[PDB]
Amino acid sequence: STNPKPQRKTKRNTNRRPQDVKFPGGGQIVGGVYLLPRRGPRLG
């Protein structure tokens, strides 16, 4: 048997896309997903 709690463990990451929207390497990841909607809130 094996029921820890999380469903990920073997496969784990594999493709990019998430490793960018988290503003990785200089980006708490909680602000670039926020830099998506108000991308340039000052245009005039």
- Type and span of the H or E element at 5: none
Give dist(CA 20, CA 30) in Å, integer.
Answer: 12
1-44: CATH topology is Hepatitis C Virus Capsid Protein; Chain A (4.10.710)
With DSSP H G I counted as helix, E B as strand and the rest as coil, what are the percentages for the chain, rounded to 5?
0, 0, 100
Q: What is the distance between the alpha carbons of residues 29 and 38, in angstroms, rounded to a whole number? A: 15
Which DSSP state fits 21?
Answer: T
CA–CA separation, 23 and 27 (whole Å) = 4
The coordinates were experimentally obtained by NMR
Burial 2-39 (b: 16+ CB within 10 A, else e): eeeeeeeeeeeeeeeeeeeeeeeeeeeeeebeeeeeee
